[PDB]
């Protein structure tokens with residue numbers, strides 16, 4: 001698979017069905033799925049799979065229900081542990097397109113309350129549970145029970161008003177979803193639903209919430225250094 005948008009296949013990538021998986025840490029993998037757009041080619045999107053405490057936690061669906069079912073089948077073959085929950089990082093197809101497949105499999109799903117409120121308007125199925133956030137961006141703990149090492153942070157409006165981010169405690173990894181672009185990116189992607197006034201502050205807030213992380217994982221590029229955060233913020237500075 002050679003995407004028009006998104007990272008290409010490299011050493012360390014395992015093809016499974018129509019998906020690609022890459023191990024990032026002993027208990028963390030990146031899932032990649034592709035949306036084939038007529039006349040344009042494939043768009044890759046990345047999410048995470050985390051093994052913690054005898055279970056698996058998923059960050060983001062694939063673009064489709066079938067692709068998300070294939071993620072669950074890869075988990076069964078390679079990890080063979082129950083998938084306890086999924087957190088999805090905003091109400092757009094690349095992050096929430098496969099909700100029905102998670103629900104059919106009995107997996108509990110979580111999203112920002114605002115993602116769930118926007119979901120139908122965005123063509124998405126809402127998650128079963130809503131996360132809420134303090135004014136400082138951190139998830140209200142009672143809304144995110146039994147999240148293991150996942151640290152869920154709402155950085156403010158940016159790529160969308162509802163975008164959230166996830167760090168993995170005890171690892172070098174933080175996940176910016178579609179908010180963060182890589183350090184060589186030429187644009188901020190689709191700004192159609194974006195908050196151009198607050199984007200730069202939201203990117204910087206993500207960086208400050210996860211100060212230690214050296215591996216920055218994002219929706220449409222390979223994992224990068226913290227230069228992805230700095231570059232995203234500087235690009236966003238130009239929007240205001």
Ligand SMILES: CC1(C)S[C@H]([C@H](NC(=O)[C@H](N)c2ccccc2)C(=O)O)N[C@H]1C(=O)O
Pocket residue numbers: 005035037043092093094095178188189190191219220
């Ligand atoms: C890769 C994208 C430019 S498209 C994706 C998202 N768009 C979708 O999920 C749409 N369903 C879509 C429409 C046509 C082709 C591909 C995706 C968005 O608008 O943020 N995230 C964007 C982004 O992360 O900047």
Ligand code: NA
Pocket residue numbers: 122193
């Ligand atoms: Na929209």
Ligand SMILES: [Zn+2]
Pocket residue numbers: 090091092159160178
């Ligand atoms: Zn989006």
Ligand SMILES: [Zn+2]
Pocket residue numbers: 094178219220
């Ligand atoms: Zn995206």
